[PDB]
Amino acid sequence: SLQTSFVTLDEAIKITNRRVNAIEHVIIPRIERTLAYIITELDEREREE
Amino acid sequence: RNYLSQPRLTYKTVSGVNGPLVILDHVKFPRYAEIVHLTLPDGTKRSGQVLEVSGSKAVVQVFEGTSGIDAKKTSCEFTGDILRTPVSEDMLGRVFNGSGKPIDRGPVVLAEDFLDIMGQPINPQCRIYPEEMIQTGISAIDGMNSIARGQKIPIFSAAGLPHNEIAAQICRQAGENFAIVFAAMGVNMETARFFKSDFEENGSMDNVCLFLNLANDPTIERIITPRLALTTAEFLAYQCEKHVLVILTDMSSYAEALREVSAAREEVPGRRGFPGYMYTDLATIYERAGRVEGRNGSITQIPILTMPNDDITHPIPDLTGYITEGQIYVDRQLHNRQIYPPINVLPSLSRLMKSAIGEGMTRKDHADVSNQLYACYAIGKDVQAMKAVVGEEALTSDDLLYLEFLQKFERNFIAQGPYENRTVYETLDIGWQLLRIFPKEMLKRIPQSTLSEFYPR
Amino acid sequence: QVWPVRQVRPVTEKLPANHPLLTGQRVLDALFPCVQGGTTAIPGAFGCGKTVISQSLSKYSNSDVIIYVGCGERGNEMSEVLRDFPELTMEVDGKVESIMKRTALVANTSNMPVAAREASIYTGITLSEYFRDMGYHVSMMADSTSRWAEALREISGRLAEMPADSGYPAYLGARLASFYERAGRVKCLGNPEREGSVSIVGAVSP
Amino acid sequence: STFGYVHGVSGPVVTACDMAGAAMYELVRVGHSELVGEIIRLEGDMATIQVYEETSGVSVGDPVLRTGKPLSVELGPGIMGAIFDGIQRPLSDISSQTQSIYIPRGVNVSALSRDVKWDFTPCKNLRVGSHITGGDIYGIVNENSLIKHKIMLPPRNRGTVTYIAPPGNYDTSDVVLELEFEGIKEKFSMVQVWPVRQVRPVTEKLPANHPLLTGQRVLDALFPCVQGGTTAIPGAFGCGKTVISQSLSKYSNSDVIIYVGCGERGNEMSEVLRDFPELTMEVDGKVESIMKRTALVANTSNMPVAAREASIYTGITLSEYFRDMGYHVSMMADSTSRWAEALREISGRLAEMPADSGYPAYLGARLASFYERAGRVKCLGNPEREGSVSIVGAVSPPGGDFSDPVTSATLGIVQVFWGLDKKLAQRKHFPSVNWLISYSKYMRALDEYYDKHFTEFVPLRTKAKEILQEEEDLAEIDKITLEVAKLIKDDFLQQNGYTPYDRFCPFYKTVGMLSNMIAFYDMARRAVETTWSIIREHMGEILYKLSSMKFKDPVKDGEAKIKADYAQLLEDMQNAF
Numbered sequence A: 001s002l003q004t005s006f007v008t009l010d011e012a013i014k015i016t017n018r019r020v021n022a023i024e025h026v027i028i029p030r031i032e033r034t035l036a037y038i039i040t041e042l043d044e045r046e047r048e049e
Numbered sequence B: 001r002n003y004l005s006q007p008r009l010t011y012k013t014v015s016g017v018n019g020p021l022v023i024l025d026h027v028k029f030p031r032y033a034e035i036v037h038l039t040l041p042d043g044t045k046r047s048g049q050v051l052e053v054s055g056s057k058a059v060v061q062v063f064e065g066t067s068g069i070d071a072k073k074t075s076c077e078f079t080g081d082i083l084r085t086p087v088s089e090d091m092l093g094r095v096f097n098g099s100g101k102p103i104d105r106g107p108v109v110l111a112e113d114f115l116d117i118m119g120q121p122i123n124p125q126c127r128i129y130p131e132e133m134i135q136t137g138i139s140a141i142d143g144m145n146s147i148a149r150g151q152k153i154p155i156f157s158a159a160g161l162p163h164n165e166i167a168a169q170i171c172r173q174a175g176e177n178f179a180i181v182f183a184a185m186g187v188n189m190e191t192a193r194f195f196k197s198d199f200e201e202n203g204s205m206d207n208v209c210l211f212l213n214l215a216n217d218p219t220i221e222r223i224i225t226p227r228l229a230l231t232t233a234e235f236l237a238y239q240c241e242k243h244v245l246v247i248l249t250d251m252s253s254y255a256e257a258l259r260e261v262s263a264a265r266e267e268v269p270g271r272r273g274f275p276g277y278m279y280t281d282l283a284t285i286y287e288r289a290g291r292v293e294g295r296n297g298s299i300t301q302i303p304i305l306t307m308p309n310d311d312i313t314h315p316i317p318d319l320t321g322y323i324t325e326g327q328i329y330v331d332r333q334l335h336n337r338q339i340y341p342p343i344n345v346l347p348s349l350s351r352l353m354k355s356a357i358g359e360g361m362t363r364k365d366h367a368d369v370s371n372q373l374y375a376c377y378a379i380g381k382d383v384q385a386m387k388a389v390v391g392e393e394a395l396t397s398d399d400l401l402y403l404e405f406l407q408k409f410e411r412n413f414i415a416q417g418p419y420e421n422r423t424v425y426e427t428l429d430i431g432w433q434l435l436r437i438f439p440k441e442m443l444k445r446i447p448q449s450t451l452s453e454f455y456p457r
Numbered sequence C: 001q002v003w004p005v006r007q008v009r010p011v012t013e014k015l016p017a018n019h020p021l022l023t024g025q026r027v028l029d030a031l032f033p034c035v036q037g038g039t040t041a042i043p044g045a046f047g048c049g050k051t052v053i054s055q056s057l058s059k060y061s062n063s064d065v066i067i068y069v070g071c072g073e074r075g076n077e078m079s080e081v082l083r084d085f086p087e088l089t090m091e092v093d094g095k096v097e098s099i100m101k102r103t104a105l106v107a108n109t110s111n112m113p114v115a116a117r118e119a120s121i122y123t124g125i126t127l128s129e130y131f132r133d134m135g136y137h138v139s140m141m142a143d144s145t146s147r148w149a150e151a152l153r154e155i156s157g158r159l160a161e162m163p164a165d166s167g168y169p170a171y172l173g174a175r176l177a178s179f180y181e182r183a184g185r186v187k188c189l190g191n192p193e194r195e196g197s198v199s200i201v202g203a204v205s206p
Numbered sequence D: 001s002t003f004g005y006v007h008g009v010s011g012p013v014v015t016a017c018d019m020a021g022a023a024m025y026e027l028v029r030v031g032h033s034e035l036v037g038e039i040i041r042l043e044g045d046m047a048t049i050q051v052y053e054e055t056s057g058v059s060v061g062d063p064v065l066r067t068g069k070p071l072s073v074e075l076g077p078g079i080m081g082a083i084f085d086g087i088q089r090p091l092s093d094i095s096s097q098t099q100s101i102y103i104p105r106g107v108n109v110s111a112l113s114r115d116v117k118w119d120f121t122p123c124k125n126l127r128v129g130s131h132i133t134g135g136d137i138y139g140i141v142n143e144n145s146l147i148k149h150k151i152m153l154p155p156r157n158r159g160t161v162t163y164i165a166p167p168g169n170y171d172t173s174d175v176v177l178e179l180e181f182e183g184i185k186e187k188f189s190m191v192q193v194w195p196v197r198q199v200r201p202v203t204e205k206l207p208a209n210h211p212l213l214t215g216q217r218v219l220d221a222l223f224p225c226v227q228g229g230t231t232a233i234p235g236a237f238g239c240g241k242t243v244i245s246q247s248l249s250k251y252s253n254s255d256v257i258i259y260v261g262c263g264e265r266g267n268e269m270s271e272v273l274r275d276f277p278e279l280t281m282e283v284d285g286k287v288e289s290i291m292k293r294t295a296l297v298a299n300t301s302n303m304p305v306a307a308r309e310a311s312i313y314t315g316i317t318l319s320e321y322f323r324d325m326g327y328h329v330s331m332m333a334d335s336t337s338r339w340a341e342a343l344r345e346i347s348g349r350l351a352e353m354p355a356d357s358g359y360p361a362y363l364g365a366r367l368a369s370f371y372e373r374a375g376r377v378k379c380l381g382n383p384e385r386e387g388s389v390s391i392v393g394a395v396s397p398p399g400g401d402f403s404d405p406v407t408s409a410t411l412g413i414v415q416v417f418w419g420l421d422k423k424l425a426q427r428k429h430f431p432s433v434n435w436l437i438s439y440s441k442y443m444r445a446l447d448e449y450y451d452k453h454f455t456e457f458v459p460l461r462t463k464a465k466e467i468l469q470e471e472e473d474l475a476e477i478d479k480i481t482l483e484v485a486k487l488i489k490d491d492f493l494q495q496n497g498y499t500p501y502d503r504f505c506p507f508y509k510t511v512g513m514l515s516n517m518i519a520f521y522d523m524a525r526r527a528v529e530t531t532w533s534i535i536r537e538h539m540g541e542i543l544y545k546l547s548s549m550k551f552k553d554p555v556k557d558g559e560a561k562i563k564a565d566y567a568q569l570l571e572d573m574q575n576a577f
């Protein structure tokens, strides 16, 4: 009852630690370096006016 | 023979001073870019170009700043010609200040010719194309991004990175007929002393024309500093036929001295405050390069620019990326790992790589192995991007070698050390070893006619 | 004959475009084909190869004449052209001769002054419109029109014009439209009844 | 002309007419209340003047009295211990002369007191008729027991001595010297006036070599700074900013300390004027106050914004004047980010183009023209003395991010960056300087001092930095290295500033403690390369000899070295066992 509980956790911890590392290294640094682009594009119109 | 002998007028009729611009009045026939000689009421001598005229007015701009200029007592003293630098072959071994004057207690130059600092554009019909490959010794510059004698190519760096430490290196070991003109715009006291005391070592001071302009010097003098550095080098080459190497420190810091003077003129801001003509005024000081037909001389530019906030989309690496003939990128992640020339080879391309390599020039496998050493680099760089997400064990046997090459590529093909030069034959024989930790048939950029010789060794 | 470069050449009646422009590239001829009598734009950043497609067009196209316009280009890139062209011989009727017989260069580098960048675009399309009237299937490589639009900005900055978005004047869409629309295959004027073409490939440097 | 009339005020700006002999950036006196203004445009006969004060109640026709001098300071005796604003008005004297609590908005009180008399002595072989050039030491004034305020010549003028003063007591308005030149016998007192935007002239700059022993163990050893160097620190609320500002004034090898509070706060400026008047320094005799070698440029955000821009330039001109006497000045700029928000107001009033995130076009050029005024440099003058100026500039970024148009511009000019962390200050790791982000570009220039003196130091630092570099990757996931790096972070790098010895250590102990913690390390590297658990259990007493080395009191000077010998040989025994 624990041998079939042991290996089913390592199939659910690996497909969870990827989704941690997909958010941490792909989704957030795509949003973060997008948000740094909206700031400068606001600024290049604030000096144009 | 041909000269002007009319005495110069001396106006005491300034009318408007707003920022660095001194608007004169009752001027009689002012030309467009005359140098005027301001005489301050406390005996200070300042100089300045004429920015624009209109009727009787003449809006000059002062080089040394405008602080102290009166309205009644100051005597602006005109000169009926354009800015002519005093240029000679004996400007070779002397340290000059920003505008034109010597630093190391020397005399003013005797100057067998007077040249226009704006120059003239070279006829593209009689402008021959650079083919003679120069040797730098740094394997990232010599082997992978080979530069030819006459090519303009910058060094892309940031603050803190050792751009000035490896630019003196290619100034040291480039290859009896090689001259060097150096321009330092906006350097520190240390960097101006680090460059002064580096050419005091190798005995290269007999062919060095150091133009220092420190950070305390006025900001309009940084405009005419790379102008005089090139028309000096357009006299040591193109009129005396010797191979000059121009190095412009801080071409970034030239452009903040171009942004500041244009905001004082209140005209047409482009991207990020830089003016609208910032492509042109970085092109009139970059396109003075290359070889011509009827001269044995040459002039090759290695400018240095610090891109702000590591962004290659900033207008300072952007507009020089369009007008030069390549770029050399210095990486900050490789500097943090104590890699010596901390250069990364992926955004650093040399446009004249296709001509300077061949069976006539250098070792026919060199032009083709650099197509493959980008491919093993570019695929392996995505592998470390993949290794951050899934795990170090989910990689297959193909993309474990792409990490195995990439770890061995940085420390063996690069990081020569600050006093070791290695030739192109030593570069390829240490560069073919990195492709021999790869198996066959994955080197897809290499044809089979050339792969058959160099792989068994 | 003397013809003003800002005035479009008169012509009989425009025709639809049916024959493709064989550029020789695999991705270009297959997925995104261009016809002779068409307008094309090649954007992209620095170091991407916007001119090595333009130099591949001037070497291996199925066009009668070629006119290459260097507008704010490099000085070495026009010297690159006139060197390697007289050894590239191509065939038409079993006879080989270099491509410099069919190539006319309008060279206006970045060192050369900024108001002349307006003229080098309008000159190179006027020679392209004149060779169209002979019946030849003219091509034209504008290189690059983003340095032409920077000449409109620098001129309008002195005239105290009010700018549009990002510095450029408000008539930027009317100068590009009055230059790109001068292309198209068209039955020419005159009695011998010949059909020419003008195909504009204009590089853009954003 | 002598006076000018107002002819219109439209805010801070005053377009004063009838000023034909007015130069740029001169200081004027607008109105009957004599508000200080700055000439900023010059349209023929009129001159557009921006006024520093509130221009409320200025009528058309008030006299504008021009001075003929730019924005300048008064350099002379009576400057030590005084508290100035950005435009050099004495805040201590302005409270006793007026007996109020507000600044009276129009008082032109002299910057140096014209009533306190000083004991002047001549230069003693500076005879009458002897030729004297600019920068020569002309006399000596005993300002305090600490500072010998050497009277110098101004760098502009020159000539031969005609009238000199006998040794006695003099005022700041008494004529001390009279010089014969070709034209005029020119006379001048003990007070010289120097503009702040103009660099003090000097003979020749030298490379900086002598390190600033600020007192802490982590700063003087791992990330050193040299006198004549530049330094940036972060500017959060609590990391270490009160420590590094006051330990460098108390225990460093600097002859004077000039602190520039550049538009800080209301009560954060009040705590500096509550603490600096009662700090004490241990000279070789009995203890004395720190206010005999300290000068304060105090400035709140309520004050005029042209006295917030010029507070940096005033504080560096006082720092460059004391450099020329031969002293080793150090200047603490706190902060520079509140100075960059003062340039945005000055250029924002002139409607100039905002270049990078609001800040004007010359933000990178005004910072680089201020950090370049530091450096060890042989001064002007025939006595041939050398001085230095060290500039420490606090950077206060929004949110603590190091990507900012003034933070990235400052870290491209400075060489030492003592990165102070809030997270290290939360865990009470004092001092809270980080070791990953912090650096020094001042390591290559200091090995000459670390070879002529202190020879066994540079193999230790180049090794112990790799120990802290290896430890961060090991803590992410060798067992000898994790223990000894814990000992360095808890004994060597950590430092309690309230212990009667550990508030300040010299360098011989600092090179002493890192010698033993490295000699214990490579021996334990050998002792495993022949068992680690027995090492942690059997050597528990010598680990107590290491972790208690920090308590070598300054009654123990040679014994502190002697105890370092005997705790070294005890490690030689147990490594073989």
Ligand SMILES: Nc1ncnc2c1ncn2[C@@H]1O[C@H](COP(=O)(O)OP(=O)(O)O)[C@@H](O)[C@H]1O
Pocket: B322, B349, B350, B351, B352, B354, C045, C046, C047, C048, C049, C050, C051, C052
């Ligand atoms: N199809 C191609 N064949 C050969 N080389 C190419 C090709 N495409 C791009 N390159 C290379 O990419 C670089 C781009 O050259 P270039 O056209 O001058 O950049 P840009 O488009 O900015 O002007 C050159 O080194 C060129 O040799």
Ligand SMILES: [Mg+2]
Pocket: C050, C051
């Ligand atoms: Mg191109």
